[PDB]
Design a protein around this ligand. Structure first.
Ligand SMILES: Nc1ncnc2c1ncn2[C@@H]1O[C@H](COS(=O)(=O)NC(=O)[C@@H](N)Cc2ccc(O)cc2)[C@@H](O)[C@H]1O
Ligand SMILES: Nc1ncnc2c1ncn2[C@@H]1O[C@H](COS(=O)(=O)NC(=O)[C@@H](N)Cc2ccc(O)cc2)[C@@H](O)[C@H]1O
Lengths: 411, 415
């Protein structure tokens, strides 16, 4: 039983009429969906949780529908959001829709027969829907009394200064209708999402009964968090131009022990048997396994190898294996960086990079043999960089002591 | 000062930025509007209060716009309504729209130059409006925190079983946008309505500022009520719903505590004439005659001179007993709603007509009441208990009016 398997990974927050869903799942392939709103040019790690859950259902033989909210992204989901969001333009949302659709696509199989993935966009039905049609055909089925009692919008209905527009309050009807629309178009009988989506999902379940006299189900995944109560993603984007594969990999390497086994369950396709065996062995490595799996999953074999090669070069101080693209990752977000004019001396580099507070202090630090230039020791306080030390004519990696790095990017 | 004149008739509940509105009114003609939703095939007396107020503004030189809610009638106004209304069909609402627009038209002047009245319909702009456009362009300007606390809908938001749909909750936004539309299309700067419309009006004022960067105003008329606290069922303007006779009699029977206020609300008599009529009644030493004046004015206004003459002829014939002056059309007003009526098969005796009309409990009782000379047939006394009606007594071959005592009537409609 797939629900039982997901419950064992800790991937089930809530599920509607669970016994019936397990029976329908047991009978044969179902169509299911999860929606993703375009509120940025990329998804982050949080979005990856239900995205991989769509693939977990596909691996079990079910048909995943990945919806991108071209219409809902023009409205804004208020669910457990403390503040009203500014509206985004139609041009910006369309740009984001395209980027998200393309980012989701490699996570699912679009060519595996009957259960092949389908990309959907709710702008296809809301983009031309008349307002009186929406209010009469959809709105009459929604009770404002029940809407104001939804946990997701309750904290917004106490004081107007921390309030909600009619625009964001109508959001629940759009996602509610999306479920009914996918049920009629594709026979979708299940919607998944994170726990904040519970109220938007149950509205679609109810609306599908009222509009199409069909029974549909809901399943939420817990919102993934760190055990120490801090905010998850200290954000971690899927786009390599926002979070480099190296930074992505390092985020996983540095997972706390209290989080590492839970993260392996949420973010990898490793069996529950191997994760438990990995946990027992360490009680009498997991961060390394987690980093390898998720980095290869998001950034591919090439991405994982670049992240490992950069990590190794920084640990060893030997930079010969680094390519120009590797240095681009370091400058982006890998190590602290400073832009400098060619001709600057070593003292000025240490001051401008904030590795040293003054030229006088930097002189003593250099003379003490604390500084490396591309991994090589340089103890002449009066030194000027050689042209060959400007790797790819652009980069020079400084290190103070055994671990304090700074990348000089030459103008 | 038009606002002050309306305040003296008791026709002003609330006014936004009153000094600025009075200054705008004194500068020259303005364009104003009032909306009427199609929830029935006719307007009633309540709807007549703001409709006549549109005419009062027109008489002062202003330009009235009478909007009929082709779109809003497909949504439903929840304002101060205890229960959620069922949605009406597009075909039914269209039929009602046509009937209401035609019923409204004779009350305003459509041919008096620059301030000629205009007929409008909000279906013109909502019929082709996309949902994302409405939600973004209009909806972003509305706070749900403020909406749920509006007096017109707050009572609906405590019991789920006695609740409000998103459909009816969205209504305030539609009427709000209508004011922005009429401001842009016709330079409408004022909306009037009854006091239940205050919140729908102020939403339009705020939205016009946000969308068109224009200053507009609101003025409400008090909801006309009775002094005894009872409900002001309905008295319709359509003669096929409320006959001119019944309409006239409703005004005749106005309570003394209500008659002068009703003159101010429902007629175009000057405040000086109404005050002189109250003064005369206060010093006459007899019962008031103002009800007669009110009945003549409003019946002539709504049903014309012909309607008034029919109501008076029917009243006079019932009072005199002599029905010779009654036409077939007059008897049809009586059968519709003038007096209680019963359908009976020709051949029924007087005793059975008294029992079936519920004028008597039994034939045995009917026998004694007939013998006591308490029964009239078409105003003529009939004291024979064993009497059968004559063919000549079935007026126009199908009407006989029975009366027990001085006022217990029943029209027999012969089959
Ligand atoms: N930290 C996290 N852990 C687990 N899941 C997480 C998460 N952060 C985000 N998610 C989930 O990732 C998904 C996409 O996030 S989202 O774009 O903010 N979601 C939304 O705004 C949905 N209303 C989108 C939507 C859903 C269905 C529709 O028919 C239409 C639109 C949601 O299911 C959300 O719960
Ligand atoms: N007893 C009464 N006394 C005085 N005025 C009364 C009344 N009963 C009804 N009215 C008024 O008669 C007018 C029409 O009544 S109604 O058809 O119920 N009105 C409505 O439902 C409004 N929402 C119509 C409307 C108004 C403006 C728009 O842009 C669109 C529609 C309103 O101004 C109402 O306040």
């Amino acid at each position: 039983n797939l629900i039982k398997q997901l419950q064992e990974r800790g991937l089930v927050a809530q599920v509607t009429d669970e016994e019936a869903l397990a029976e329908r799942l047991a009978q044969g392939p179902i169509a299911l969906y999860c929606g993703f709103d375009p509120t940025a040019d990329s998804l982050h790690l949080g979005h990856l949780v239900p995205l991989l859950c769509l693939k977990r259902f596909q691996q079990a033989g079910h048909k995943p529908v990945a919806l991108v909210g071209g219409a809902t992204g023009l409205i804004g989901d208020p669910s457990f959001k403390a503040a009203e969001r500014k509206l985004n333009t139609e041009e910006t949302v369309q740009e984001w829709v395209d980027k998200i659709r393309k980012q989701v696509a490699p996570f699912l199989d679009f060519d595996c027969g009957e259960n092949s993935a389908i990309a959907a966009n709710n702008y296809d039905w809301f983009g031309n829907m008349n307002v009186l049609t929406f209010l009469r055909d959809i709105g009459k089925h929604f009770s404002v009394n029940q809407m104001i009692n939804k946990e997701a919008v309750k904290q917004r209905l106490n004081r107007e200064d921390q309030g909600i527009s009619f625009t964001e309050f109508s959001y629940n009807l759009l996602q509610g209708y999306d479920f009914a629309c996918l049920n009629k178009q594709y026979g979708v009988v299940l919607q998944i999402g994170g726990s904040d989506q519970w109220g938007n999902i149950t509205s679609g379940i109810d609306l599908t009964r009222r509009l199409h006299q069909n029974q549909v189900f809901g399943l939420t995944v817990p919102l993934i968090t760190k055990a120490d109560g801090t905010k998850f993603g200290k954000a971690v984007w899927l786009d390599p131009k926002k979070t480099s594969p190296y930074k992505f990999y390092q985020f996983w390497i540095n997972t706390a022990d209290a989080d590492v086994y839970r993260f392996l369950k949420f973010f990898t396709f490793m069996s529950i048997e191997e994760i438990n065996a990995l946990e027992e062995e360490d009680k009498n490595r997991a961060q390394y396994v987690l980093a390898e799996q998720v980095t290869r999953l998001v950034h591919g074999e090439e991405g994982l190898q670049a992240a490992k090669r950069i990590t190794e070069c920084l640990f060893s101080g030997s930079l010969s294996a680094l390519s120009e693209a590797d240095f681009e990752q370091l400058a982006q977000d890998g190590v602290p960086m400073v832009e400098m004019e060619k001709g600057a001396d070593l003292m000025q580099a240490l001051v401008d990079s904030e590795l040293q507070p003054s030229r006088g202090q930097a002189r003593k630090t250099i003379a003490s043999n604390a500084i490396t230039i591309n991994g090589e020791k340089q103890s002449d306080p009066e030194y000027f960089f050689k042209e060959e030390e400007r790797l790819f004519g652009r980069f020079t990696l400084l290190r103070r002591g055994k671990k304090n790095y700074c990348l000089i990017c030459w103008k």
